[PDB]
Paper text:
Tailed double-stranded DNA (dsDNA) bacteriophages and their eukaryotic counterparts, such as herpesviruses, possess a dodecameric portal at a unique vertex of the capsid; this portal serves as a channel for DNA packaging during viral assembly and delivery. The P22 procapsid consists of an icosahedral coat comprising 415 coat protein (gene product [gp] 5) subunits, a dodecameric ring comprising portal protein (gp1) subunits located at a unique capsid vertex, and an internal core comprising approximately 250–300 SP (gp8) subunits and 3 ejection proteins. In this study, we present the structure of the SP gp8 in complex with the dodecameric portal in the P22 procapsid at subnanometer resolution.
When the density map of the portal and domes at a resolution of 15 Å was displayed at 1.9 times the standard deviation, the side view of the GOF nodules revealed that the outer dome contained three neighboring four-blade windmill-like structures. The four blades of each windmill-like structure in the outer dome were connected to the inner dome through a column, with one blade contributed by a side nodule. The results indicated that each windmill-like structure comprised four gp8 subunits, constituting a gp8 tetramer. Each blade comprised a base dimer. The tetramers interacted with other gp8 subunits in neighboring tetramers through electrostatic interactions between the base domains. Local reconstruction of the top region of the outer dome revealed that this region comprised gp8 tetramers. The SP tetramer primarily forms through interactions of the C-terminal region (residues 122–136) within the column domain; this explains why a recombinant SP fragment (residues 141–303) does not form tetramers.
Author numbering:
A (entry chain B), D (entry chain F), G (entry chain H), H (entry chain G): 70 to 88, 156 to 245
B (entry chain A), C (entry chain C), E (entry chain D), F (entry chain E): 70 to 245
The structure:
Amino acid sequence: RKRQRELEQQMEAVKRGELFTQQSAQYVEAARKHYDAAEKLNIPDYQEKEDAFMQLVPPAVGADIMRLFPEKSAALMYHLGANPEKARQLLAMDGQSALIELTRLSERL
Amino acid sequence: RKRQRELEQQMEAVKRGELPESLRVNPDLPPQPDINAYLSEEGLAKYDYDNSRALAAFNAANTEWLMKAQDARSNAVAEQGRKTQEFTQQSAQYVEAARKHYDAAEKLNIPDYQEKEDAFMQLVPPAVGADIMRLFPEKSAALMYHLGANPEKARQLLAMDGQSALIELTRLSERL
Amino acid sequence: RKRQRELEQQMEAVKRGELPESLRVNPDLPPQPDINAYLSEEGLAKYDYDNSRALAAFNAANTEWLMKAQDARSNAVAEQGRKTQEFTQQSAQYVEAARKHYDAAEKLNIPDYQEKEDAFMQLVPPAVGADIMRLFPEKSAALMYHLGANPEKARQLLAMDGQSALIELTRLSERL
Amino acid sequence: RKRQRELEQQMEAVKRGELFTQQSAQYVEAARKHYDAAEKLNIPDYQEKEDAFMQLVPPAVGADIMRLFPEKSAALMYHLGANPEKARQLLAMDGQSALIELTRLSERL
Amino acid sequence: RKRQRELEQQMEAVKRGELPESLRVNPDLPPQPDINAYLSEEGLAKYDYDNSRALAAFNAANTEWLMKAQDARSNAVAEQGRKTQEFTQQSAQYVEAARKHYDAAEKLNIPDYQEKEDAFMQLVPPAVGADIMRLFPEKSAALMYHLGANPEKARQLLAMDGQSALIELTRLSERL
Amino acid sequence: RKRQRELEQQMEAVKRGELPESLRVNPDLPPQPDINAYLSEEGLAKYDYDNSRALAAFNAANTEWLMKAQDARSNAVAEQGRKTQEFTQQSAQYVEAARKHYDAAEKLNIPDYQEKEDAFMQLVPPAVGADIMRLFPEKSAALMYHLGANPEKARQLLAMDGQSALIELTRLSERL
Amino acid sequence: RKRQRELEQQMEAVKRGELFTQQSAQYVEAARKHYDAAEKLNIPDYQEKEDAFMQLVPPAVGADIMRLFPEKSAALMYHLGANPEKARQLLAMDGQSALIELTRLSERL
Amino acid sequence: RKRQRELEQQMEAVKRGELFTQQSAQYVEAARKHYDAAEKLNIPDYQEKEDAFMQLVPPAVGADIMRLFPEKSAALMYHLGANPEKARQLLAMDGQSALIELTRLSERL
């Protein structure tokens, strides 16, 4: 709940005028549905995997996948952290093929 | 065919080494340490009121600037070679682009591909089309056909970024 | 044949690397910054009456002259290699020149090519003839024949520029 | 007539001593025969094509073609602006082949 | 065959780049201008009794020594490449040497070539034999045979220079 | 198989260029000549009591340190390339190591090779085993078998050096 | 006997404190058994061969073979000086294969 | 005799210390045997031919042939000046084939 609290603190500082804001607001809502989908995942070990994700990808690509797929995002990062070898190969590779594995993760559901 | 002919002519232009001046990577020489600011009487007052340490560390600064500018020019050569190699791989994937255009003319044979391709070129930037033909070579013709059948979808695609387009397209492809 | 023999002998002379001293590109070393003008008492009076900044910026000037003269000599090597490559491409297009002279002797067979070619060589500078044989290899013989049939046109061509002359060459060719 | 006026103003400033002048004078006369050849063309839509020409080629090559061919220059630029795809390909290419199309434009006349 | 095997093994040793330390061309760095001799009080007395011109021209001397030593090392690289190319052409002509030894074993078939070749190797320096096999490949076997038939002529050839010996070789060849 | 799988996986790790930081050869920059010790008043008293020769030879020392540090870094690159080439040749001889492990599994087929190989790995350092498999590839399995049949000989081999431990290996091989 | 005298002089200087000493002492004893094996060889022409050996190999490898094989060392160097072509090829080659010929020299005895 | 006098003057200046000298001395002796061979030729018209030779070849190649063939040099240059067409063709050609005609001149004698 602490990460939600700090994200909400940053966003309320943004809306208070402590200055590009519209997408951040959509990221607030997409994070709400993100943790909804995290409950939908219901494998309580995903916290270390998502910690590893934020520490290994830049915030930009994580934000992109966070906003793209509101209903499957938690499972997407959980299973790409399950196979982080492909995560680093896609750190070397262009994001199009990583996007393809994201789409196949959509394919299973 | 004429569009393919100009594409392949650009290809042999690239393969020989016709590299535009804009593509010439100019070395980013780091600034040299200043002369007056360091080795003036104020610098002497820093270093116990003597010209000695000023000349010492300025000779050292000369040397370090020499090595960092040398590394800058050697880099300039290095990413010039890297740019040459990325022209080579571009050229390769454009060879498969020309070959898949041959393949589309060989296999598709159903639609009015010429004018729909013209409309798609006129609509989207060439980079998006290049990515489409690189990742979806054989279906690119049918994809342009279905996009031409949907001009409303076409100017969504115009209004929005190339990568996204990828999927939704990829998607659209797997919807069909 | 003897003219072709001397042309091809010049060719093997070029291919081995017989490069005349006039073709040796001497490096254009930029002038070094002056010694007395910068680092004298007048320079000291510029820089708050001290030998300090004078020695500082003169060491800096030494360093920058070292790098610019180094870049000058490295360039001299670079355009020496460029000149070698342009000798190679010349040599190539002169190989097609000798081969098209073979082709003219093989195909034309109609005119008195030797003396008309001699007259054309005696009239125009060799550069114009080289450009003519490079761009219009097979028709060059008939072109010299028709020019010899028109001495008045011949000394117009003599009086006027090479690029300019060819037009004549070319629109005369498409008149025939 | 405005472009003629500004060219003549620049050239009379040059001849007044406001400083390479001999070729500029020959360019004055070659521009006179240029607009003579423009009347010889007599397709009144060439103004936008020649505007595009000056804005896409450097002044040097336009000057070269202007001085080379006094009697056909207007038609030369009109028809190379008709096909400006070859104009940009020759911006990429050496000027020798562009010169070849100039010569073929001479060939039609 | 074993002599041919060791010759060709030396060949693949050369082709990979096994270059002996004696063949490493050390750069000939020109001497730097002297420090005390130029920029002492005697030099000052030359230049109107002041340290000024001494430091000026010594910085200039530093710069010119930097460029001449740089040209020296760049040359060292240049004739190192030239030496590599002359190893390549040596290697080529030794490839024809091995191939003509094959040809001699194929064609001659008449004499006791092995021991006469051994005697010729034991007599003359290897450079003379290399030149003989380079210019007269096919007849070299019969030439060694006729020289072995003439030991008195053999030790004239030993006593006298390689170029001269050759004519001998050659006008003996055209005597036969 | 799993040991062979990890060996070959290390192989493809090496072939791509995964080079550990310990294998990064740091350049050995020679020390720069000292500043105070040379160009102080004691140095002036050496050179006839003047700052002149001190600045002269210190500029010279700057230049020579620049060239020796430059040669040091160019060397660092040179033995980095040499280290890359020795990784390539290791990789080659480890490719024959994996291939001879295939060959042993194909041909030997008699002994319990897995656990005897495990014991031999646990006993001797990996370098000795690497040399054994490099020089005696096919017999290495039977050699480990006979060593496992002789634990007393095994811990002699442990107690004593690899070149000799090997002797042991080889004259044991020719005893059998 | 002169080489024994100079080796013993160097070693007694070492033991006197004129400075890595333990292996030198073992080299004293291994040289004693070396010349024992030299008598075992009993072909009195080996002196020039061993002179050539010391002048063509570094002292390190000669010392290594001297210490490795106390009972066969004299014959080893006598027969590698008999074939010094292999000696120089092993100067070019790694010492492992030279060691293999040393082992085969052990094989004959 | 004047050319001998000037050559000897240059060589005695060289030996006096007015400075690569050993080959010049051998050239003195080879010139002595050169004019011995010139007497052996005994066709008194060779002076203009050798004047033409020195004025058409560089001194280096003339010196090389002078030193190579002490006994036949005069006839060599006399007959290559007889056919100076081959002399200029070999000015264009590499010296190896000129050397071949020198060898055939040796073949006649």
